[PDB]
């Protein structure tokens, strides 16, 4: 259902192949993964912090 996809619901795809080192690979996708239109980028100049300010 469309609503179920809206929430994400921890959808994952498992693929098993012999060529894989462990024969198991998991992938997932969500609204964030595709293309977030908004970008609340905040580049703080912080003349002097040295460490994590």
């Amino acid at each position: 259902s469309e609503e179920e996809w809206n929430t994400g619901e921890t959808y994952t795809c498992v693929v098993a192949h012999e060529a894989l080192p462990n024969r198991v690979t998991e992938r997932t996708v969500d609204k964030s993964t595709g293309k977030p239109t908004l970008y609340n980028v905040s580049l703080v100049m912080s003349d002097t912090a040295g460490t994590c300010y």
Binding site: S46, T48, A49, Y53
Partner: peptide, 8 residues
């Protein structure tokens, strides 16, 4: 997206 860029 927060990035602090210390100058010194």
């Amino acid at each position: 997206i927060r990035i602090i860029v210390p100058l010194n």
